[PDB]
């Protein structure tokens, strides 16, 4: 789960994409933030596209 803070828990519906995390052996996928019950990151500004976060005002 990428980003600072999430909202996922048991029974969270979720969408995964490829890509391993080098540090966590056995992890080989990432949760696409901003889809299904995965939220975007609150207060994110740079690279918002990669984190499910919509454009602020």
């Amino acid at each position: 789960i990428p980003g600072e803070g999430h909202n996922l828990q048991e029974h969270s519906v979720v969408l995964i994409r490829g890509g391993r995390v080098k540090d966590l052996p056995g992890v080989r996928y990432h949760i696409v933030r901003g889809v299904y019950d995965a939220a975007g990151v609150k207060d994110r500004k740079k690279s918002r596209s990669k984190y499910g976060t919509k454009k602020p005002k």
């Binding site: 600072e4 803070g5 999430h6 909202n7 939220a39 990151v41 609150k42 207060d43």
Partner: protein
Amino acid sequence: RKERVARLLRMHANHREEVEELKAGDLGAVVGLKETITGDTLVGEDAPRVILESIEVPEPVIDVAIEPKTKADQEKLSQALARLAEEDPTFRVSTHPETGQTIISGMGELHLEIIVDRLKREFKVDANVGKPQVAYRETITKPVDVEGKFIRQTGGRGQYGHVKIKVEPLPRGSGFEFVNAIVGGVIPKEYIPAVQKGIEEAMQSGPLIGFPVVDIKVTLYDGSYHEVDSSEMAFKIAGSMAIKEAVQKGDPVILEPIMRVEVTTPEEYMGDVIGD
């Protein structure tokens, strides 16, 4: 997302009727939407993308204030909660306008017993709490009719705002109603936005225990102006005085929060429970 209103139906007692249109204020069954669920708002393709208040209301019920203690790490508490205002959006972090503190609203005694606990044993947070849950509200018992004057023409520098409103009691739960009954233009069209900024703001603190005044209707019907003196900051504070005075007038009191409580006990202690 876009969707394709294909056909359009009306259910009768003994058959379905296909119609060619559905005028506003009427209702029926549209066939063809795929990804639309309940509470979603549908508008025309070429049309202002509004979201009707569909799906609504929480509400938080326990008010615990957390004083940021000391003092150059207040920003980590205001950032811990920005991690918590997204993991758990049931609660509210709001600064008291006057007295000026950050108050952690919530959903019960236990809900703040976990947030203020996880806050400390994971983030350290230099801060401590009391605190009650003194989270009442305020409303009136009878319809009141007052004025809202705000005049300072003792030097020329602005300050004229006249307002007269009918504040009636609303059925409990309906929130806040606001109608604009100005006949003609005895108050200008541009001063109407920010005279609600004085009413809606003067309801956030109350007349007896200083808690949000909810469940009333406000009909603004009268008021005069000065062409030179009338500033938008002189029509805001005329509505604030009037409401703080109107709410104060016709019988206001304390609406406390009630709980639906399901206690799951062994039957041996049921009476110990019930009576108590």
